[PDB]
Write a protein of this length. Structure first.
Length: 130
């Protein structure tokens, strides 16, 4: 499923993402935008280390979910990577919450540093009623 902007904003809000570990909804939206373009089926294979990023927040199979084919992989969010390709993003959200409970917080996603950190992210939630 490819979410429309405000549809996603409300979905994330209902899932308890607004202010989770101090992260605003606009930051989560900027992250989802740059990571997957709001596409729940987004996948990106990393030939270099043989891992794959799954779903709307692109969780890496080397550490966050299990797909069985990633060398020396761990499953920190304790989920099958398949769970991160569903239209229902509840599990992807739980995994994203797990990531930010670590010290880096939202900084765990490099794409966030490059295109959301210290930027005007108001546009992601403007007009969505959140």
């Amino acid at each position: 499923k490819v979410f429309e902007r405000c549809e996603l904003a409300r979905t994330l809000k209902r899932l308890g993402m607004d202010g989770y570990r101090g992260i605003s909804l606009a930051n989560w939206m900027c992250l989802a935008k740059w990571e997957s373009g709001y596409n729940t089926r987004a996948t990106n294979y990393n030939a270099g280390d043989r891992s794959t990023d799954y779903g709307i927040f692109q969780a890496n199979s080397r550490y966050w979910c299990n797909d069985g084919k990633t060398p020396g992989a761990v499953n920190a969010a304790h989920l099958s990577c398949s769970a991160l390709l569903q239209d229902n993003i509840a599990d992807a959200v739980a995994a994203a919450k797990r990531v930010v409970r670590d010290p880096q917080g939202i900084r765990a996603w490099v794409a966030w540093r490059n295109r959301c950190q210290n930027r005007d992210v108001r546009q992601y939630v403007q007009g969505c009623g959140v």
